[PDB]
Amino acid sequence: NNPLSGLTHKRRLSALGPGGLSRERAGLEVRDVHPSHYGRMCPIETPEGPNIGLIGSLSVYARVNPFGFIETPYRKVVDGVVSDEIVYLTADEEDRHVVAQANSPIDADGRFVEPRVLVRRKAGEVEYVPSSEVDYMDVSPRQMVSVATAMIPFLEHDDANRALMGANMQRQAVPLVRSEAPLVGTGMELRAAIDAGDVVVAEESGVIEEVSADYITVMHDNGTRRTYRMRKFARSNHGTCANQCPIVDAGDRVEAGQVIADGPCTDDGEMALGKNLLVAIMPWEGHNYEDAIILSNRLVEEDVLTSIHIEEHEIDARDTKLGAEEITRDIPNISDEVLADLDERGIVRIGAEVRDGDILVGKVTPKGREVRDTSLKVPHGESGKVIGIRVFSREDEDELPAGVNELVRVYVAQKRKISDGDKLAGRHGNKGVIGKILPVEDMPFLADGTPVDIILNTHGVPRRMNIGQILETHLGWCAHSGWKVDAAKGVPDWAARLPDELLEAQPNAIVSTPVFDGAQEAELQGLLSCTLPNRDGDVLVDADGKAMLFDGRSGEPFPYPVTVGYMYIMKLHHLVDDKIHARSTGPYSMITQQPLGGKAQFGGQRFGEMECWAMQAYGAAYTLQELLTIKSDDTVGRVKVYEAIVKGENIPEPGIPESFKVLLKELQSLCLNVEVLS
């Protein structure tokens, strides 16, 4: 889906396989978090289904030793003085020592400030011990989380369930046409993007010689050259787009290890999985009811949440026992208008628009002239532009499989805008489908006339114990607006421990709040209380993080101030265009004459046993009878019903279904004498 999904897929540990656990038989005690997982397996990121607790992700600092046991670094302390000498310990080795936390106060050297220190002990036990009894020390307060979980700002303010959901859902975001990095991050994004490998990095220092959308040429110091080719509009395993864009000029000088081009979800070498949107946290007319979302129409006009998806279609020409089925434009009994887009060979032309039912590759097979039409079509609900064709011909000594002459492949791409039914999500486990998309003219707007891009309901935040989204909203407004702490007479007491270079910022400043060592509540209040004015010279959000909005439909100001700010929204790969399906008649299974199952097979919706229980409880006998007989496997009833409907007649009576006959035949095959008495 994106670089993060693959990176986390490679760093995955699974307990089930040829010689492991069973996804069903596994009990509740093998799926639990163990004290020995601290620093070796992340406790947050796991699936939600039957694989809950059986598949995990390796921690950031962990490594495996030769025997196959996961290790983790610890910082040695001598006589209560923390030294800088990292040692890697296995769980059994670690159980013989006591290790302190990274958040242990220090006094500019190793010496511990406090006389007693809270330490970890053998079996998940913590005790206060004098500072002279401490053996080791963590290297950071993020030693236990994994890569995906380390990209959630204000993680410690979120409950475990929502953090798990957010970590899982960051791996489902789709690349967008244009990317932008978050206003408020955590810092585990530059390295995540670089290590994933979807960006292009300069191997050696030099000066960019020629830069184009297709390549970059670097003139190394020693006189050598190296050209990098960018993969443009490629297709991923999941149908997304993998396009790389250079981010260097024609005279710039690069350094070894510097990012030289971007990737799918990268912005200047940093992960950028979503967009920054101006949000309101009020309930609005019931359109954002029960996890639904309301969007502005600007996000559609300006292609903020637009994506490119690529399909792959292929057909082959076999020898066949009949003989030599061929690809050509001469298809019998087809209007010359229907063959307008096909070229001389018999394939569509690049740059042609294709719709459902359109011809992609004309082919005829000699069923016996008797040559029928077996051409390649565009499936239901699929369209776009033909962007490429690849044809392999045996006549050109191509390594084709046995018995095939041509293997033409066709790629069609389409840009998808955001629409009702698509799934959005933030980084804190907040998700929902788009209930409505409103005109810009009837969105709540600020005193200066700025509409809000998205509206989230108030009733979902406090119940789910994910209050990190509100903190992210506050800090995002602070970063977007800019600030300046008025330290005219000493810094305010709430900014005493605030790092220098953080007492002032310009509009649209990018900041980071690491996972367990970041911004505090007092600092957030202080920053909210001192922000720069807007263009006119007015402060729109007060010290509480709440603004006074207008009603776009009636024009009256809302009675009470609302909470506004900026948060990071991602577009999940759960689009409604891939989920709508309908059927009236189509293929049927051969053993039992019932409709096939599957959207790709043009199948029918299963009416299982519990729906039958519900229908029997209603007392609806005729509905159930028709569902079971004339809609599923009554071979003559189906055709009679279709004839009756296409005429003005009324539906006939049903008959014996075919599955009962199949059951009787199987029972007889078991050597049982089954008979129907009358």
Partner: peptide
């Protein structure tokens, strides 16, 4: 105050962290 100084062409992202990292990822 910034986040990263090892990667050459990295964006200047300022951090609220108060702790020093002895070891690099």
């Amino acid at each position: 105050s910034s986040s990263n100084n090892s990667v050459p062409g990295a964006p200047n992202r300022v951090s609220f962290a108060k702790l020093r990292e002895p070891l690099e990822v």
